[PDB]
Amino acid sequence: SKNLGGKSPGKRFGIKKMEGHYVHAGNILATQRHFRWHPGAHVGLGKNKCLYALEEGVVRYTKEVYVPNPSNSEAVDLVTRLPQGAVLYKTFVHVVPAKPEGTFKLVAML
Amino acid sequence: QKRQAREQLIEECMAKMPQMIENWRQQQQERREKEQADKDRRARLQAE
Amino acid sequence: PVENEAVAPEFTNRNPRNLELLAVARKERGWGTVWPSREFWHRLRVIRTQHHIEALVEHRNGQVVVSASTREWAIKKHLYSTRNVVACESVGRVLAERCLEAGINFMVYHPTPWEAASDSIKRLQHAMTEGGVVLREPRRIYE
Amino acid sequence: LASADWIAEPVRLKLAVKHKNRINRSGELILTSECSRYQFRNLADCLQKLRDMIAEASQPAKEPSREDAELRRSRIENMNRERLRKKRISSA
Amino acid sequence: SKTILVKMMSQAGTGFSFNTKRSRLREKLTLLHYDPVVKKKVLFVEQKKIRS
Amino acid sequence: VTYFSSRKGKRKTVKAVIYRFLRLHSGLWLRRKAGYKKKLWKKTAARKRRLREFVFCNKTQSKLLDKMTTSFWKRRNWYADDPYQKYQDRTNLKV
Amino acid sequence: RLQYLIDLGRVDPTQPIDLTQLVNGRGVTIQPSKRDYGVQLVEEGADTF
Amino acid sequence: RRAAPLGPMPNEDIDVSDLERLKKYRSFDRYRRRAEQEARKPHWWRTYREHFGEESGPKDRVDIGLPPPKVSRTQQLLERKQALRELRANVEEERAARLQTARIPLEAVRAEWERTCGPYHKQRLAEYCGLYRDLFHGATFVPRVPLHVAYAVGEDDLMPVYHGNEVTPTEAAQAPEVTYEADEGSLWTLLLTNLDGHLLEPDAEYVHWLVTNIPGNRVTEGQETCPYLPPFPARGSGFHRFAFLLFKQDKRIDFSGDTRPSPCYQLAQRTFHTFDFYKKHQDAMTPAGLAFFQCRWDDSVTRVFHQLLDMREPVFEFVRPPPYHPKQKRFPHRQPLRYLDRYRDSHEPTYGIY
RNA sequence: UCGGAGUACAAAAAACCCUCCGAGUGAUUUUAAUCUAGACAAACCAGUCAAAAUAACCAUAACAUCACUUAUUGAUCCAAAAU
Ligand SMILES: [Mg+2]
Ligand SMILES: [Mg+2]
Ligand SMILES: [Mg+2]
Ligand SMILES: [Mg+2]
Ligand SMILES: [Mg+2]
Ligand SMILES: [Mg+2]
């Protein structure tokens, strides 16, 4: 026949944790084919572009201004051609950290 | 005797390492310059 | 016993500067789609207007902690040509001074590749270094 | 520590230097072990620690080598509080 | 063109091997790799030809 | 599986299990990952690690293996020098 | 277990204690057919002993 | 199903029709700037700032200050214009500029700074370190009078206390030299407080050194309420912050209530709330100067607790929370062997009946 | 058999002897380590990410890169190799 091999299963690309959820460090917050959500505060980026939590806490999604890295040719070109008032916005994921960093305890009284 | 032979071999070849990798770095840096000099001496002979 | 001897097991340290000085605090890992890296306790920020040179020391809160500007009368009146390389060096020295006085010895500086090549900034960094302020913050502990 | 005669005087004094942190206001040197559920193993850990301390203190060849990793902050903040300390006028 | 799977050996005297896809019409391969036993970056030179 | 043997009338074990699995005494079975010696040059070091693991089997597999295996293999073993003696009891399990 | 056996007068510490004595107090069970090579002594009750 | 934007959408302003006639920033840098200005405005959508704690956001500041110095705008402006004309006039200066050789007389800049915008910088450093948050709770004052504090480390050695700086307790074993500029109809009160490091009471602090009814710049002439007590952080806890406060008072104030014994080595006796103490005398006292320093445990402090306070010495650790493990499952599936160790109690064999 | 787009309009999944493009690899040097919290995905088998900690290197130096990058692949046993 003419048409062939269109058959492949879904990749289950989606957003795993949602706004307001609790997370433990290392949880995958999302997984994506192209950048849809960008990693924000305390969110690590994997090499497959999936976002995971670096800290125990609460997930939050946010719109924010996008200022690409100057080592990236494409993005700087896209930014450079904008009309003088315009600002790129994107969607970010953060984890607002929950536990305090650590505590001070009384070891021994000398 | 096996352990001492292994350790001997390892010390022996670890003493030879900087000379080897330096020699090979010079070898490759000489190869690159040989090829580039070829390409320039060809570029100038085609230009003329 | 002694009425002084009472302690309580858990010590509350109310001081916000503390865990940073100890290096134990949390930097902000993340972003890394965007730029610059927001991972730091303190960051040196150098803004160059066509007129004035302004060097700020920032906290990730965005709050300016200690700064030196050329609009400032103290610096403006002693020297000449606010936009010069001379001015950058100057501001750097002033800022180093005020930083030591503020108790902050470490900060991160993330310049642009072409700002790193420029003279004014090379000498800003030199002034900052001889001033005793190290760029490149200490690592985190159990990061 | 001062009343312990089974250790020499130079060593008895050098111990009270390095270990002054774990010494007590009553003059006592306190060692502690934790790990095993068996206190034979804890006692043994303590005794081995003590043996080691008396070992390194009785060695005059101990150079007390310090790492730069956690001490970089210490050297630099030291030097940088020394830039300010350098103001010279007599006082009091 | 075909590529080839070569077995590369350490010059650190430690028997250690790793295989690499290498161009058939190219020269004998030599690299700077990591040897785990010596725990160093060392010179590896291709000992053998494994798969074609 | 032979449920009743011909000579003894007992129940036989399937030896093909006993070569690839390991039964801790708790009832957990332990196995190698599949394809861990296969085509190593072609794989990531991360994947290679994931392959070099010893992993646990889900309940279904476990029950299947238990059926395929006689009583002798479920006995409490004390071996001298045994790596796995550490792992044969279960601890802190609230169910 | 050794202490608990001595306390209850199963094995007596007075005469020497070897494998047969442990077996006769039923403090321990050996099955050579399973390649048991004998008893080993472990430290669980060390402090209490 | 669409919803309707609430207020303005960000780029809705510029015209898409005729893009060629619109000016662009062809600079990465201009863009970066514009973006950082956009990142500071109060948007109507969920933002980073909102969740990450701008720390009360907008706050109306109760201000207990000294009134700002009154100076003529136009006069000052003219004088500065002239000074800069003069300085720009010289050829020597220009030579110093082109050839990259020039220096700024840092002492004079420190002088002008102390005179001009210094108070504000010191203020925001104090806000940064949360002096105002633990002292007056809501209140911000601008340090109009400069406060110069120093310690004698030896005969020739002088260790200054600037705002925020680090000092060792060895240096601070003695009462410091204090200097500020006032003529005398004046009366002042100087205060040294340890903002944290109180052992029992999280919300309370220690008064180390409290002096009162201070004529002019004369330090020793004032009657000391609380005798100088050297800094004593505890070994474990890092970096306590000590605060020198200066109050301009009008009427002579006498307090038998706040007066402490002459040796006063009891901790219950020095327990202090700067807020309360200020509430009391609030009518006469107006806080003027400020200088504060960071201080961490060092050797000498051990002598304090034993020798002075007649105490054992408390030592602390930094204790991190135990790592989080999921509920243990009967049949951990496809999990590494070392799984069974995460739920392990302690590493030791235990033979139950055996 | 594997992948991309539509079918399948906005979390996931989703069929057809349905509509369309592809893969069974090149090229390159930056030759891309050990160990381990927590997860994704999932009938099973297989697949995916990944903090901290070690060791390598500037002497606080761990994502190979490009071609739409996604796919360029194959279990046991058994054979050859000797590590
Ligand atoms: Mg499809
Ligand atoms: Mg399908
Ligand atoms: Mg038995
Ligand atoms: Mg004006
Ligand atoms: Mg799932
Ligand atoms: Mg790491």
Side-chain angles (χ1 to χ4, degrees), chain A, chain B, chain C, chain D residues 1-61 64 69 71-92, chain E, chain F, chain G, chain H:
Chain A
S1 61
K2 295 205 305 182
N3 290 133
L4 282 183
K7 341 188 302 167
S8 69
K11 261 46 203 70
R12 287 109 240 257
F13 288 144
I15 149 186
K16 311 306 187 187
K17 298 290 171 135
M18 212 97 19
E19 153 99 358
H21 277 286
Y22 202 72
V23 263
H24 299 278
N27 286 345
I28 312 231
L29 301 185
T31 178
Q32 57 194 334
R33 171 144 35 235
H34 305 294
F35 287 94
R36 170 172 176 182
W37 317 280
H38 300 91
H42 303 277
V43 168
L45 174 69
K47 51 199 202 73
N48 54 38
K49 307 177 211 171
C50 79
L51 321 180
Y52 63 100
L54 297 159
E55 302 292 337
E56 163 148 334
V58 181
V59 186
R60 301 287 179 192
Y61 289 78
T62 284
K63 314 307 195 179
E64 273 174 76
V65 296
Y66 176 71
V67 183
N69 175 42
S71 309
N72 182 1
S73 67
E74 299 198 357
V76 168
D77 297 339
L78 173 62
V79 134
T80 276
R81 286 174 266 157
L82 296 159
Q84 254 220 340
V87 185
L88 252 301
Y89 277 75
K90 297 286 186 176
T91 308
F92 293 93
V93 208
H94 328 270
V95 185
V96 172
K99 310 276 182 191
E101 176 55 57
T103 329
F104 290 103
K105 288 294 179 182
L106 174 75
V107 169
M109 229 183 51
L110 298 189
Chain B
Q1 290 157 5
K2 284 185 197 169
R3 291 179 191 173
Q4 303 316 309
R6 253 284 177 262
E7 290 290 352
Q8 272 296 302
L9 192 54
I10 283 173
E11 303 155 14
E12 283 172 0
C13 298
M14 225 51 203
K16 296 179 178 180
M17 221 47 239
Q19 317 159 13
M20 290 191 66
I21 57 186
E22 181 183 13
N23 181 41
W24 170 73
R25 203 89 77 172
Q26 297 169 356
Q27 171 60 25
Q28 191 182 13
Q29 198 74 356
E30 179 182 9
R31 191 57 178 169
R32 292 175 178 176
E33 290 177 5
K34 173 55 191 178
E35 296 176 351
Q36 187 213 11
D38 289 335
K39 298 177 181 183
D40 293 343
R41 289 158 201 179
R42 287 163 208 171
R44 291 180 185 179
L45 275 189
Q46 298 165 14
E48 295 158 17
Chain C
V2 189
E3 291 184 52
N4 294 349
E5 215 86 26
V7 274
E10 177 174 358
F11 180 66
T12 298
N13 193 319
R14 262 168 129 182
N15 162 229
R17 188 77 196 290
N18 168 262
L19 285 170
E20 287 154 351
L21 287 178
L22 272 183
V24 204
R26 243 188 300 266
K27 302 188 187 183
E28 256 194 44
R29 313 213 284 291
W31 315 89
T33 279
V34 281
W35 182 92
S37 159
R38 302 211 59 256
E39 174 174 19
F40 57 78
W41 298 300
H42 298 275
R43 120 207 214 191
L44 168 67
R45 183 87 207 289
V46 176
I47 319 167
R48 314 174 70 199
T49 288
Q50 80 167 3
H51 291 148
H52 299 252
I53 297 296
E54 201 149 11
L56 322 173
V57 172
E58 274 185 40
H59 180 55
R60 79 160 167 284
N61 279 340
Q63 293 302 323
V64 179
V65 166
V66 49
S67 78
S69 52
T70 3
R71 309 178 309 159
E72 188 178 356
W73 176 241
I75 316 180
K76 196 178 184 177
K77 84 173 199 179
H78 282 336
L79 236 55
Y80 169 54
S81 298
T82 286
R83 179 52 190 174
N84 281 13
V85 165
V86 179
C88 286
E89 256 197 3
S90 311
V91 168
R93 310 209 327 169
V94 189
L95 190 57
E97 178 73 13
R98 296 181 181 167
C99 273
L100 300 195
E101 287 179 4
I104 115 189
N105 319 312
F106 304 103
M107 70 193 53
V108 196
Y109 181 59
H110 285 148
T112 331
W114 60 79
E115 287 175 17
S118 77
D119 275 325
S120 44
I121 286 187
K122 297 219 186 200
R123 309 186 72 179
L124 216 181
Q125 284 174 19
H126 246 283
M128 205 81 66
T129 297
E130 324 304 338
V133 174
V134 207
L135 309 184
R136 200 183 171 196
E137 284 186 346
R139 206 173 165 275
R140 193 183 146 190
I141 301 185
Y142 292 89
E143 178 187 299
Chain D
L1 229 203
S3 172
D5 42 322
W6 67 78
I7 28 192
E9 268 302 330
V11 181
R12 191 183 325 180
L13 291 200
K14 274 192 176 183
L15 276 188
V17 177
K18 290 181 187 172
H19 307 339
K20 59 101 192 297
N21 297 93
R22 40 183 41 177
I23 315 186
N24 182 19
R25 84 159 162 180
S26 56
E28 311 280 317
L29 169 73
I30 293 183
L31 290 197
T32 269
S33 189
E34 203 61 20
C35 52
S36 175
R37 92 167 84 273
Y38 316 113
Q39 46 201 43
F40 279 59
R41 293 218 175 101
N42 300 323
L43 234 191
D45 253 350
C46 285
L47 297 184
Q48 193 51 43
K49 279 162 194 167
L50 193 62
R51 286 154 184 264
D52 281 322
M53 303 187 326
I54 300 175
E56 67 160 358
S58 189
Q59 291 152 0
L71 284 189
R72 245 164 241 176
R73 269 156 302 171
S74 213
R75 298 170 193 177
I76 297 179
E77 87 178 4
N78 216 31
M79 257 227 44
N80 285 350
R81 88 156 150 282
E82 280 182 9
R83 290 181 197 259
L84 310 162
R85 182 179 161 179
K86 224 165 296 174
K87 310 310 168 180
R88 281 167 224 164
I89 279 175
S90 52
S91 289
Chain E
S1 64
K2 301 169 188 175
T3 52
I4 196 188
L5 189 65
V6 304
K7 176 192 202 174
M8 292 182 52
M9 195 72 50
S10 344
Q11 297 310 322
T14 288
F16 188 82
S17 313
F18 80 96
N19 327 130
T20 296
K21 221 70 184 173
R22 158 219 152 190
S23 187
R24 159 154 293 165
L25 302 169
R26 224 185 194 179
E27 50 208 16
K28 181 177 187 173
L29 190 40
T30 313
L31 304 171
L32 294 175
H33 207 84
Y34 189 101
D35 184 281
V37 170
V38 198
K39 295 188 170 188
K40 298 293 164 125
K41 190 127 170 174
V42 202
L43 188 90
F44 287 56
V45 192
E46 153 200 2
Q47 177 153 337
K48 289 173 182 180
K49 156 187 182 184
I50 296 193
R51 196 195 181 178
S52 320
Chain F
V1 177
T2 295
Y3 304 93
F4 298 94
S5 77
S6 168
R7 323 283 211 81
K8 283 292 158 115
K10 307 172 168 197
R11 161 196 209 101
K12 287 185 177 180
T13 214
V14 171
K15 288 293 183 189
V17 172
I18 252 42
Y19 297 148
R20 21 214 131 175
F21 294 88
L22 168 75
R23 205 188 113 90
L24 313 176
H25 185 94
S26 168
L28 307 191
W29 288 81
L30 198 68
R31 72 159 224 256
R32 222 85 151 87
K33 215 88 169 56
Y36 82 97
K37 309 162 59 188
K38 272 301 189 66
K39 299 178 188 303
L40 291 193
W41 60 272
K42 199 194 278 201
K43 295 179 186 188
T44 303
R47 187 177 170 191
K48 264 185 267 190
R49 171 125 45 262
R50 259 177 262 122
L51 291 182
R52 254 175 294 102
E53 294 288 350
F54 299 83
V55 285
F56 289 112
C57 316
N58 78 334
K59 180 186 182 178
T60 311
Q61 287 156 353
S62 283
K63 283 191 45 189
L64 161 69
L65 292 178
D66 275 323
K67 281 179 197 164
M68 273 201 283
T69 263
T70 350
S71 155
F72 167 90
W73 298 93
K74 301 161 190 186
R75 76 181 306 258
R76 180 43 140 304
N77 282 334
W78 310 96
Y79 296 116
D81 303 327
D82 190 23
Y84 297 113
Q85 193 188 283
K86 179 186 184 184
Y87 292 105
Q88 297 209 331
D89 242 283
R90 216 96 145 65
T91 104
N92 299 338
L93 196 51
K94 299 222 170 181
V95 172
Chain G
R1 181 137 179 92
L2 188 70
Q3 181 63 87
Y4 162 75
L5 293 168
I6 287 195
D7 267 337
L8 288 191
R10 293 222 223 149
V11 294
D12 71 309
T14 319
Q15 291 193 11
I17 291 198
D18 72 312
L19 209 31
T20 291
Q21 288 317 287
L22 296 176
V23 163
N24 279 13
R26 345 281 171 156
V28 106
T29 288
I30 309 302
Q31 38 253 354
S33 76
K34 294 320 169 205
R35 273 77 55 189
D36 274 42
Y37 269 83
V39 161
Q40 84 166 322
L41 233 186
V42 234
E43 51 279 353
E44 258 286 273
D47 311 343
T48 314
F49 186 81
Chain H
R1 198 54 185 178
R2 268 295 176 78
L6 341 165
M9 217 56 134
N11 305 272
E12 77 186 355
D13 291 325
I14 85 264
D15 283 338
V16 183
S17 60
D18 201 327
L19 279 183
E20 196 173 349
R21 282 178 198 165
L22 293 183
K23 202 191 171 188
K24 357 268 192 196
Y25 20 47
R26 330 104 193 160
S27 150
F28 167 90
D29 209 310
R30 282 182 230 172
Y31 179 85
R32 185 178 198 239
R33 273 194 186 178
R34 183 56 191 166
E36 295 182 46
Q37 292 171 13
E38 271 293 310
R40 287 176 192 127
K41 297 180 181 183
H43 309 307
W44 53 261
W45 57 76
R46 293 314 137 275
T47 191
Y48 171 83
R49 273 173 157 183
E50 181 186 332
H51 282 114
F52 271 93
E54 210 58 54
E55 291 281 353
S56 183
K59 173 71 182 182
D60 296 324
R61 286 304 175 165
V62 213
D63 185 332
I64 29 175
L66 274 197
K70 285 182 171 177
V71 193
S72 45
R73 330 85 152 153
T74 308
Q75 204 181 73
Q76 157 208 106
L77 184 61
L78 269 177
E79 298 172 13
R80 295 185 179 175
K81 290 283 187 183
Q82 294 162 20
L84 295 177
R85 294 160 167 180
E86 300 171 13
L87 181 53
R88 178 157 304 197
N90 318 339
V91 192
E92 21 143 280
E93 295 297 320
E94 197 122 342
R95 295 176 195 187
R98 307 131 165 272
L99 309 177
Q100 309 289 2
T101 312
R103 291 283 176 179
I104 307 214
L106 304 182
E107 299 182 356
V109 214
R110 158 85 187 175
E112 265 286 348
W113 176 87
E114 195 79 290
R115 207 174 130 256
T116 324
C117 39
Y120 296 111
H121 292 205
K122 314 225 289 177
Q123 182 202 303
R124 72 185 171 181
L125 282 180
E127 253 276 337
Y128 176 43
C129 264
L131 276 291
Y132 305 128
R133 188 243 293 148
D134 278 41
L135 292 173
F136 318 91
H137 292 54
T140 320
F141 69 83
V142 188
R144 299 293 181 190
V145 309
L147 219 177
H148 300 265
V149 192
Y151 280 113
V153 208
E155 298 185 6
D156 315 326
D157 277 328
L158 211 56
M159 169 94 81
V161 176
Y162 308 90
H163 36 271
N165 182 31
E166 193 211 9
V167 194
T168 319
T170 298
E171 283 72 347
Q174 293 298 328
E177 292 71 24
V178 180
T179 306
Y180 56 92
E181 295 195 347
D183 46 86
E184 6 93 8
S186 305
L187 303 169
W188 307 76
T189 282
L190 194 92
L191 176 59
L192 180 55
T193 316
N194 180 224
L195 290 198
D196 29 76
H198 184 115
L199 310 185
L200 286 195
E201 283 181 42
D203 322 334
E205 37 201 26
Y206 287 157
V207 149
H208 281 242
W209 177 41
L210 178 53
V211 90
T212 328
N213 285 20
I214 294 284
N217 185 27
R218 300 278 168 182
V219 204
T220 324
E221 292 185 0
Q223 50 174 21
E224 63 174 11
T225 310
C226 219
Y228 184 90
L229 190 69
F232 61 130
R235 193 148 116 243
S237 38
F239 297 99
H240 307 207
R241 17 164 206 161
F242 296 87
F244 290 109
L245 281 182
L246 230 205
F247 303 90
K248 218 190 217 176
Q249 42 168 31
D250 325 323
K251 303 239 168 183
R252 283 218 147 176
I253 331 179
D254 204 313
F255 6 82
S256 59
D258 320 28
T259 308
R260 324 255 175 180
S262 24
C264 67
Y265 290 129
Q266 300 308 288
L267 285 167
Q269 293 172 6
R270 326 164 168 262
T271 295
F272 200 76
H273 304 87
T274 290
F275 192 74
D276 297 330
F277 162 86
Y278 183 83
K279 273 287 207 198
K280 270 184 151 196
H281 316 136
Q282 181 169 14
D283 287 321
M285 283 179 192
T286 319
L290 167 65
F292 69 98
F293 71 95
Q294 300 283 351
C295 180
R296 62 197 264 186
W297 180 98
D298 105 83
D299 218 328
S300 62
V301 187
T302 305
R303 287 174 173 181
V304 172
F305 289 92
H306 300 159
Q307 191 181 11
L308 299 210
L309 319 185
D310 197 356
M311 274 193 63
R312 302 184 199 175
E313 170 196 349
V315 180
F316 296 102
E317 244 315 317
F318 193 69
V319 173
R320 306 172 193 259
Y324 155 72
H325 293 303
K327 273 186 199 178
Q328 190 177 356
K329 303 181 313 167
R330 173 87 100 250
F331 284 97
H333 177 39
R334 210 119 97 58
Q335 280 292 320
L337 173 58
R338 72 220 180 215
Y339 174 92
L340 281 170
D341 271 328
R342 304 168 187 162
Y343 305 102
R344 186 88 68 184
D345 206 33
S346 54
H347 291 267
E348 288 289 359
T350 28
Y351 313 75
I353 56 186
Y354 287 107

